[PDB]
Design an enzyme around this catalytic site. Structure first.
Site, PDB file in Angstrom:
ATOM      1  N   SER A   1       0.137 -21.295   1.963  1.00 61.90           N
ATOM      2  CA  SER A   1       0.014 -21.129   0.520  1.00 61.90           C
ATOM      3  C   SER A   1       1.213 -21.731  -0.200  1.00 61.90           C
ATOM      4  CB  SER A   1      -0.134 -19.647   0.174  1.00 61.90           C
ATOM      5  OG  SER A   1      -1.222 -19.064   0.870  1.00 61.90           O
TER       6      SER A   1
ATOM      7  N   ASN B   1      -6.573 -20.039  -0.018  1.00 64.96           N
ATOM      8  CA  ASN B   1      -5.774 -19.615   1.127  1.00 64.96           C
ATOM      9  C   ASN B   1      -5.121 -18.257   0.889  1.00 64.96           C
ATOM     10  OD1 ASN B   1      -3.017 -20.080   3.016  1.00 64.96           O
ATOM     11  ND2 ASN B   1      -4.909 -20.991   3.819  1.00 64.96           N
TER      12      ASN B   1
ATOM     13  N   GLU C   1       2.662  -3.166 -11.281  1.00 66.40           N
ATOM     14  CA  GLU C   1       3.338  -2.043 -10.638  1.00 66.40           C
ATOM     15  C   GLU C   1       3.077  -0.744 -11.390  1.00 66.40           C
ATOM     16  OE1 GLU C   1       5.243  -2.177  -7.755  1.00 66.40           O
ATOM     17  OE2 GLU C   1       5.410   0.009  -7.872  1.00 66.40           O
TER      18      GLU C   1
ATOM     19  N   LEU D   1      13.929   0.353  -7.287  1.00 60.99           N
ATOM     20  CA  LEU D   1      14.136   1.340  -6.233  1.00 60.99           C
ATOM     21  C   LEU D   1      15.497   2.002  -6.419  1.00 60.99           C
ATOM     22  CD1 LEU D   1      12.901   1.070  -2.662  1.00 60.99           C
ATOM     23  CD2 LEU D   1      15.289   1.726  -2.994  1.00 60.99           C
TER      24      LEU D   1
ATOM     25  N   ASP E   1       7.403   6.721  -5.159  1.00 60.47           N
ATOM     26  CA  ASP E   1       6.432   5.666  -4.917  1.00 60.47           C
ATOM     27  C   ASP E   1       5.514   6.057  -3.757  1.00 60.47           C
ATOM     28  OD1 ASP E   1       8.434   5.561  -3.063  1.00 60.47           O
ATOM     29  OD2 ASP E   1       8.860   3.419  -3.276  1.00 60.47           O
TER      30      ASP E   1
ATOM     31  N   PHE F   1       8.672  -9.012  -5.604  1.00 56.63           N
ATOM     32  CA  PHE F   1       8.872  -7.610  -5.955  1.00 56.63           C
ATOM     33  C   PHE F   1       7.954  -6.708  -5.142  1.00 56.63           C
ATOM     34  CE2 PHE F   1      10.745  -7.887 -10.549  1.00 56.63           C
ATOM     35  CZ  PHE F   1      11.995  -8.112 -10.015  1.00 56.63           C
TER      36      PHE F   1
END
EC number: 3.2.1.17
Length: 189
Positions: free
Chosen positions: A135, A150, A29, A50, A38, A122
């Site tokens: 998956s 996958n 991030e 956030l 962001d 996240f």
């Protein structure tokens, strides 16, 4: 070269004497000690924490002040950034285990792949991660090669391909070679 390497590792040990999923989510991030915006224009601080989606300017400062419990002007510190990060991780993992669509997989995996799943949550939100049924099944069954084959086919792959590639290799090997203070130590090692 080897002499210079030993010198540098000694420097590293000294800097440590003067002075983990946190480093992973920092590399992916990105960390900031001041309030910024962001890619969507919302108010975030630290690592993906956030603050507020509202158009209000001071709606992020009040969120921060109520969260950390301090009257900071928007400039938090390192350990408090990691504290907010651990808080967000606890919240996300609670959501994961409550949804139960991810609980069996999350309980099937080890710590490293659990942190990778937390990274996915996240990034795209638990709802978006829940849309990887194949998956997820291949992860709880512990077929890693096919699970990585996958996971490389998704909007999450085209959108952010490098972060996806790192998370996918982390799922594969179950290690921290990808994403590899602690980093300088391990890598000089």
């Amino acid at each position: 070269g080897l002499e210079k390497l030993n010198e540098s590792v000694l420097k590293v040990n000294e800097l440590n004497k003067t002075l983990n999923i946190f480093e992973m989510l920092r590399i992916d991030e990105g960390l900031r000690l001041k309030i910024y915006k962001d890619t969507e224009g919302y108010y975030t601080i630290g690592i993906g924490h956030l603050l507020t989606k509202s158009p209000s300017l001071n709606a992020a400062k009040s969120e921060l002040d109520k969260a950390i419990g301090r009257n900071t002007n928007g400039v938090i510190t390192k350990d408090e950034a990691e504290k907010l990060f651990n808080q967000d991780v606890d919240a996300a993992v609670r959501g994961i285990l409550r949804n139960a669509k991810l609980k069996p997989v999350y309980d099937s995996l080890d710590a490293v792949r659990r942190a990778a799943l937390i990274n996915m949550v996240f990034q795209m939100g638990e709802t978006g991660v829940a849309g990887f049924t194949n998956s997820l099944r291949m992860l709880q069954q512990k077929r890693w090669d096919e699970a990585a084959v996958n996971l490389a086919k998704s909007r999450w792959y085209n959108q952010t391909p490098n972060r996806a590639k790192r998370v996918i290799t982390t799922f594969r090997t179950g290690t921290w070679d990808a994403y590899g203070i602690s980093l300088v130590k391990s890598l000089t090692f």
